Design an enzyme around this catalytic site. Structure first.
Site, short mmCIF file in Angstrom:
data_model
loop_
_atom_site.label_atom_id
_atom_site.label_comp_id
_atom_site.label_asym_id
_atom_site.label_seq_id
_atom_site.Cartn_x
_atom_site.Cartn_y
_atom_site.Cartn_z
N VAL A 39 0.79 -1.22 0.00
CA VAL A 39 0.00 0.00 0.00
C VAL A 39 0.83 1.28 0.00
O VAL A 39 0.25 2.33 -0.32
CB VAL A 39 -0.94 0.09 1.22
CG1 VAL A 39 -2.11 -0.88 1.11
CG2 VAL A 39 -0.17 -0.15 2.51
N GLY A 40 2.11 1.21 0.35
CA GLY A 40 2.98 2.38 0.35
C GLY A 40 4.45 2.01 0.39
O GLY A 40 4.81 0.84 0.25
N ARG A 41 5.33 2.99 0.57
CA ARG A 41 6.76 2.72 0.61
C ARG A 41 7.56 4.00 0.85
O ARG A 41 7.00 5.09 0.73
CB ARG A 41 7.24 2.11 -0.71
CG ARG A 41 6.89 3.00 -1.91
CD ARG A 41 8.09 3.80 -2.39
NE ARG A 41 7.73 4.71 -3.47
CZ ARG A 41 7.06 5.85 -3.36
NH1 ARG A 41 6.64 6.27 -2.18
NH2 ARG A 41 6.82 6.57 -4.45
N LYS A 43 12.07 5.52 1.47
CA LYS A 43 13.51 5.38 1.66
C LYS A 43 13.86 4.33 2.70
O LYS A 43 14.82 3.57 2.54
CB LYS A 43 14.09 6.74 2.09
CG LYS A 43 15.26 7.23 1.26
CD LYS A 43 15.54 8.70 1.52
CE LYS A 43 14.49 9.29 2.45
NZ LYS A 43 13.67 10.36 1.81
N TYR A 44 13.10 4.27 3.80
CA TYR A 44 13.51 3.38 4.88
C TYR A 44 12.58 2.20 5.07
O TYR A 44 12.80 1.40 5.99
CB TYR A 44 13.64 4.20 6.18
CG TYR A 44 14.55 5.40 5.96
CD1 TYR A 44 15.90 5.21 5.67
CD2 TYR A 44 14.08 6.71 6.02
CE1 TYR A 44 16.73 6.28 5.46
CE2 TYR A 44 14.91 7.79 5.80
CZ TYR A 44 16.23 7.56 5.52
OH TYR A 44 17.09 8.61 5.31
N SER A 45 11.56 2.07 4.22
CA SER A 45 10.65 0.94 4.40
C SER A 45 9.72 0.63 3.24
O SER A 45 9.68 1.32 2.21
CB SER A 45 9.79 1.24 5.65
OG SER A 45 8.89 2.29 5.32
N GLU A 46 8.96 -0.44 3.44
CA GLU A 46 7.88 -0.89 2.58
C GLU A 46 6.68 -1.29 3.46
O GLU A 46 6.87 -1.98 4.46
CB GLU A 46 8.29 -2.06 1.71
CG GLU A 46 9.48 -1.83 0.79
CD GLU A 46 9.50 -2.90 -0.29
OE1 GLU A 46 8.50 -3.64 -0.38
OE2 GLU A 46 10.51 -2.98 -1.02
N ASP A 150 9.02 15.68 10.82
CA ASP A 150 8.75 15.41 9.41
C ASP A 150 7.27 15.58 9.07
O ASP A 150 6.66 14.73 8.42
CB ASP A 150 9.23 14.01 8.98
CG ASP A 150 9.39 13.86 7.47
OD1 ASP A 150 9.36 14.85 6.71
OD2 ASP A 150 9.56 12.72 6.98
#
Ligand SMILES: CN(C)c1nc2c(Br)c(Br)c(Br)c(Br)c2[nH]1
Ligand SMILES: CN(C)c1nc2c(Br)c(Br)c(Br)c(Br)c2[nH]1
Ligand SMILES: [Cl-]
Ligand SMILES: [Cl-]
Lengths: 325, 325
Positions: A39-41, A43-46, A150
């Site tokens: 469903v998303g992603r 730089k530091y994850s999926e 952020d």
């Protein structure tokens, strides 16, 4: 420079609240949670929608890319400290692959609609409503001694039919300690405050209030992102072209900061552009004098001058939202 | 001009809440309350410490000088509407002389110390504390659709040993109705806002916030009263000598108001005097950057620009007071 509010929270708390390096993680069971779809992603994850096999409830699974012990313990500790606060995403479990030891964070599920599709449909009242919900989150984490660092629409999840909002991605968050000098490489570029861009390292919760003003500005004027820079130097220039350089100068003098020579030349001299010059036919239904007054009080160079989260929730822009509550 | 907050309170309430002229007073028993000693007085009354013969508890008795049916019903109704709110003096009973029919209002007792003796002894923290207590009162009555219109130290009762505060004398109070034109002959002279002094009659709750700034200024600078005028025209001039005439001019243009010619000449042209020029050796222990920032945001010509009561309670000046709470 020191925060004007919540400054002694971590001083007064027991050291186990903030000394995240001392945490010992209590890993859960990897098999409890099954991946259903991406469903998303980032730089530091999926990130995937998942299912808790025990209760068949939906959840969100954040599989981390390889990360340092120090970094992940910081994110976990902060999330556990905030769990249960207003509009903070809830961290439900922490698990990891036995063979590879890849960590996964497990979160509540949110039927979010990407801001590029949803924000065009929001009414004047809708905008007041969702931004009030975001402020609750921010006042909460500040009062718990934490800066998000952020803030941006991609990190605000929204279910429009249920009208529920969650503040996500605590990857850059950090604990506030009086006088500590921080790394300025935080936030996302279109949302970075002037403090980050001129290398003032003893910043504080007020950084998040700049980022929120950037987001808010994009929404009422339907100009996203509002400050559209290509790199950190250009980012500072686009800001300078709206706010004006005179106030930038009084800012650098009070904090006794000097601009890189190269920087100084790009920035240049510019007069302030008043906010109604942004008003036009695709945004005329969202720009009101109270929207503009609230915006104006968030976007200031001097971090010490911005509204706090607590003050912002009382601005008359939100009077209807408060009454309904 | 309309209020920026609480504007529709009386619109939404049933007409019996605000139509005070319809009230039928339910007189109590004159004999229940015995006068023990005189303690204060004013243009419209004489005030005594009393005793409730039933329970032998102390009370305060406000014997009214001859007053019109309309006027007294307004004060009674407003007091009954507010009874039980934060730091609002409690009206306990209403009674009157049978032979003369002189009315008396009966109130809770407060061991007050006149501000000329007590304020010199207050610490920096004490001042933050008592002013926060006053704000609770003001946000409450505004939110109930009422303007006090006579804020000043003489109308703030304080028991210093118990540290308890009450807002008294509701004689000039009135209900807010969108667009209604009010009489500008209200408040006390040293505390009258610019709206009253230039004859802008559609004013609102924000008038009280000017008066509070006047009081607050007297206390941190130990200069009482702060704006010391001899008459209404001179009152406007003393203000002009601090705030400056340029902002006075932008004010009169936006509301489309013209100054009496005579007025105009007295006022004159003056540059703003910054608030630290008031700082000196007898007040140096009370003047802080947060005190000055809070003051600055109350004393503005344009009523629409002043802090609301609700916003003011969140200013970082009061951060310690809030934390203790
Ligand atoms: C890209 N990224 C880091 C990210 N995407 C998320 C989405 Br979509 C949802 Br819904 C939730 Br809940 C969280 Br937690 C998310 N985290
Ligand atoms: C002069 N005047 C109108 C006045 N004086 C008061 C005092 Br002293 C107390 Br204590 C109380 Br409680 C109230 Br009510 C008062 N009202
Ligand atoms: Cl996340
Ligand atoms: Cl009184």
């Amino acid at each position: 420079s020191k925060a004007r509010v919540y400054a002694d929270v971590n001083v007064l708390r027991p050291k186990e609240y903030w000394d995240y390096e001392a945490l010992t993680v209590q890993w859960g069971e990897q098999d409890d949670y099954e991946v259903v779809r991406k469903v998303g992603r980032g730089k530091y994850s999926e990130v995937f929608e998942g299912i808790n096999v025990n209760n068949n409830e939906k959840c969100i699974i954040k599989i981390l890319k390889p990360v340092k012990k120090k970094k992940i313990k910081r994110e976990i500790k902060i999330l556990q400290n905030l769990c249960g606060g207003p509009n903070i995403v809830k961290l439900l479990d922490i698990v990891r692959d036995q063979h590879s030891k890849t960590p996964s964070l497990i979160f509540e599920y949110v039927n979010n609609t990407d801001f590029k599709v949803l924000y065009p449909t929001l009414t004047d009242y809708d905008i007041r409503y969702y931004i009030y919900e975001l402020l609750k989150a921010l006042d909460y984490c500040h009062s718990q001694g934490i800066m998000h660092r952020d803030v941006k629409p991609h990190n605000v999840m929204i279910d429009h039919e249920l009208r529920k909002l969650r503040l996500i991605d605590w990857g850059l968050a950090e604990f506030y300690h009086p006088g500590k000098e921080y790394n300025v490489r935080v936030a996302s570029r279109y949302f970075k405050g002037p403090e980050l861009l001129v290398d003032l390292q003893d910043y504080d919760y007020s950084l998040d209030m700049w980022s929120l003003g950037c987001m808010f500005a994009g929404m009422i004027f339907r100009k996203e992102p509002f400050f559209y820079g290509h790199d950190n130097h250009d980012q500072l220039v686009k800001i300078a072209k709206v706010l004006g350089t005179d106030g930038l100068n009084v800012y650098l003098n009070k904090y006794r900061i000097e601009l890189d020579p190269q920087l100084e030349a790009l920035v240049g001299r510019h007069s302030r552009k008043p906010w109604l010059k942004f008003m036009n036919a695709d945004n005329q239904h969202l720009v009101s004098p109270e929207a503009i007054d609230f915006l104006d009080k968030l976007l200031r160079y001097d971090h010490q001058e911005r509204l706090t989260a607590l003050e912002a929730m009382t601005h008359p822009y939100f009077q209807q939202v408060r009454a309904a509550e």
